[PDB]
Amino acid sequence: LELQEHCSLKPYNTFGIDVRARLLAHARDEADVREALALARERGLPLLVIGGGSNLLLTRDVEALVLRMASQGRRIVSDAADSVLVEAEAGEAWDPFVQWSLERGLAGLENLSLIPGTVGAAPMQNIGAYGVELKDVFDSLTALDRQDGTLREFDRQACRFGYRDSLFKQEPDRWLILRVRLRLTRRERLHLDYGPVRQRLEEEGIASPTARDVSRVICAIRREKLPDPAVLGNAGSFFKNPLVDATQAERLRQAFPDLVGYPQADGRLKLAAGWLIDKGGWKGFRDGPVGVHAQQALVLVNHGGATGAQVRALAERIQEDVRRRFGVELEPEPNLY
Ligand SMILES: Cc1cc2nc3c(=O)[nH]c(=O)nc-3n(C[C@H](O)[C@H](O)[C@H](O)COP(=O)(O)OP(=O)(O)OC[C@H]3O[C@@H](n4cnc5c(N)ncnc54)[C@H](O)[C@@H]3O)c2cc1C
Ligand SMILES: NC(=O)c1ccc[n+]([C@@H]2O[C@H](COP(=O)([O-])OP(=O)(O)OC[C@H]3O[C@@H](n4cnc5c(N)ncnc54)[C@H](OP(=O)(O)O)[C@@H]3O)[C@@H](O)[C@H]2O)c1
């Protein structure tokens, strides 16, 4: 395991918070996972699973065995022509898995290009971008049950996926995800509902656009506009878009005719949290070593030397302010430890 004691977790989280782990272990398969568990329980410690630390807010030194998930394996399980079942291990890095699938002429992941982190973590938060979510192509996964050590498979329904949500995010510390299966496609329609994607693809004038083309466009948009954690510490969009009631949407829109919201099948409005934050006047905010990025209003940043507590308390302040200004509660995306 390359077990390690009293160890900075700085390089293991994208916010670049510097706290220490009682023990840090790397895992490369079920054997190692099972061993880390045993040990964790040997030493009387809780176990904290991490992938690439791209959706993690650490707020304190971690009295626990931290297990960096780093197993490997990407393969075609089964080819059924218009769809192909594929499987990847939890430690596989996400965007390179996407690239893998596209190099095999499989579509369905392109809209999730360049999302950081790991395959293992993807179902926990039901990763989504540009009109697509992991559940849309999800087939099943295999998870270790932390209450008794057994393996279980979850099919799509069992995972109780929702917007930036799953059974696994709902029952924290219960399931350890080992590998993931997705059903990808050939020959289906591209997902181009997001204007900037559609327009940037048009401008390249491909005769017959494919998934690979869509992926290059999305990677380019994301590199252009998104703070890279390796320069400016962050965990991406800090806040989920809030969904409001119809009569509450009605009321907010009376207050604000410029309000940005997207109607749902059930009558509710998905508000744009960037718009809210911006309009509450936080864009580019800065106060000691924390702030909100000047352009991307969802991206909370560590300008350098922030504590996790500082990011937390800034998030809290913004939430509080937006509750008070718009009557809306913004939920966090990152997992808080
Ligand atoms: C610059 C940037 C852009 C981003 N853009 C997007 C985006 O477009 N869409 C989107 O959805 N997200 C986005 N994110 C968030 C993030 O990349 C995803 O949430 C990602 O799935 C987290 O993966 P990770 O491996 O980094 O998870 P970590 O941050 O390592 O872990 C997240 C949570 O999952 C748990 N976990 C991790 N692995 C396992 C496992 N194997 N079994 C059980 N639990 C586990 C951890 O304990 C933790 O609670 C972005 C983040 C950044 C920094
Ligand atoms: N969570 C993260 O860390 C992270 C980081 C980077 C990008 N992203 C995602 O990647 C995509 C691009 O991000 P962005 O920050 O540039 O925002 P964007 O495309 O400028 O869109 C801004 C806001 O409008 C919404 N939106 C735009 N077009 C839409 C449509 N056709 N239908 C429904 N909603 C629409 C987005 O919702 P949605 O967010 O619901 O799409 C978001 O609230 C988004 O889908 C976003 O979720 C996420």
Residue numbers in the entry: 3 to 339
Task: Quote what the paper states about this structure.
All MurB proteins known to date are monomeric flavoenzymes that bind strongly a stoichiometric amount of flavin adenine dinucleotide (FAD). The catalytic cycle can be divided into two half reactions and follows the scheme of a ping-pong bi bi mechanism.
Crystal form A belongs to the space group C2 with four molecules per asymmetric unit, while crystal form B belongs to P61 with one molecule per asymmetric unit; the solutions are in agreement with solvent content analysis by using Matthews coefficient. The two crystal structures are identical in protein and ligand conformations, except three loops involved in crystal contacts on one side of the protein (β6-β7, β12-α5 and α5-α6) with an overall root-mean-squared difference, rmsd, of 0.8 Å, based on 336 Cα atoms. In the following results and figures are based on crystal form B unless otherwise noted. Ala-83, located on the β6-β7 turn, is a Ramachandran plot outlier in crystal form B with well-defined electron density, possibly because of crystal contacts. In the substrate binding cleft in domain III strong continuous electron density was observed that corresponds well to a bound NADP+ molecule. This suggests that the nicotinamide group is in a position that favors the first half-reaction. Crystal form B also shows electron density at this position, but refinement suggests that this site is occupied by a water molecule or a metal ion at lower occupancy. Potassium binding apparent in only crystal form A could be due to the five times higher potassium concentration in the crystallization liquor for form A compared to form B crystals.
